[PDB]
Amino acid sequence: KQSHERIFENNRAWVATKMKDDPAFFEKLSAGQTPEYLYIGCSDSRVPANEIMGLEAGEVFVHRNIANLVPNTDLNVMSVINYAVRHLQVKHIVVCGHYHCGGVKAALTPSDLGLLNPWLRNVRDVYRLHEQELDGIQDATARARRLVELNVIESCRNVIKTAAVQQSFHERQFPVVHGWIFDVETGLLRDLEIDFEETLRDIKKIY
């Protein structure tokens, strides 16, 4: 309960430092700046997107969920993507995963987690789509790291499959989609080099 007071005191100190360090920060923040990026990341990742990316917050529209998923029938993430593309006219969409991801780890443990099961089932489906690759990695840690990367790649594919991204990219040549991995050990972003154009053509084949 003392926790409440602690946060409000920190907020006041942060406002004072921000006013002293940056004169027009609140004025700029209260002024409208349209974000250039949609970032989809994990709820249990440890550093905010704009810090990692060295952007000012206001430049990144953010969605975070367990294990940075983009499931087909999830209106929560689909409404984020639709708003970002059709309302904000964002030029970049990023899916960013991270190593030491509790969401991805939890997905592999054979427990019935009731309500969590259908969410984490999406990660187990990534595992089955890439079973030969993953089963050929003998070290548990390296296998887990590869699963986090494949999960990002499949989340990226799911973004590219949205009608919002396909229609916008056809009519206007944006946005592009990237998959990244954030490594807490070094703080460095690594690009997974999802081939957007190749993936977009691969997906448009049907029709």
Among 69, 85, 94, 101, binds Zn ion (CB under 5 A): 101
Using the rule CB under 8 A, is 196 a contact of a copy of itself? yes
- Determine the 3-state secondary structure of 60 from DSSP: strand
- In terms of CB distance, is 44 or 59 closer to Zn ion? 44
The DSSP 8-state label assigned to residue 110 in this structure reads -
- Considering only residues 17 to 46 of the shown chain, the ones binding Zn ion according to CB under 5 A are 42, 44
- In terms of CB distance, is 13 or 129 closer to a copy of itself? 13
Cis omega before residue 175 (within 30°)?
Answer: yes
> Quick check: 169 and 175 in contact, CB under 8 A?
yes
Angle at 165 between CA 59 and CA 28, to 5 degrees: 15
Active site residues per annotation: 42, 44, 46, 98, 101
- Considering only residues 24 to 63 of the shown chain, the ones binding a copy of itself according to CB under 8 A are 25-27, 29-30, 32, 35-36, 43-44, 46-55, 57-58, 61-63
In this structure, the number of other CB atoms found within 10 A of the CB of residue 55 comes to: 15
98 in a labelled binding site: yes
Binding site partner of 174, from a copy of itself, Zn ion, none, Cβ cut-off 5-8 A by kind = a copy of itself
Using the rule CB under 8 A, is 167 a contact of a copy of itself? no
Chain centroid to CA 81: how far? 11
Q: Phi and psi of 19, rounded to 5°? A: -65, -50
- In terms of CB distance, is 11 or 142 closer to a copy of itself? 11
Name residue 145's amino acid.
R
170 in a labelled binding site: no
Name residue 165's amino acid.
V
Name residue 88's amino acid.
L
Stretch that binds Zn ion, among 94-102, 129-137, 163-171, 172-180 (CB under 5 A): 94-102
How many residues touch Zn ion under the rule CB under 5 A: the total is 4
Using the rule CB under 8 A, is 22 a contact of a copy of itself? no
96 in a labelled binding site: no
Binding site partner of 101, from a copy of itself, Zn ion, none, Cβ cut-off 5-8 A by kind = Zn ion
- Considering only residues 68 to 107 of the shown chain, the ones binding a copy of itself according to CB under 8 A are 74-80, 82-84, 86-88, 91-92, 100, 102-103, 106
- H or E segment and range at residue 135: helix 131-135
For residue 99, CA distances in Å to 9, 45, 117 come to 33, 9, 21
42 in a labelled binding site: yes
- Considering only residues 68 to 87 of the shown chain, the ones binding Zn ion according to CB under 5 A are none
Angle at 185 between CA 179 and CA 188, to 5 degrees: 40
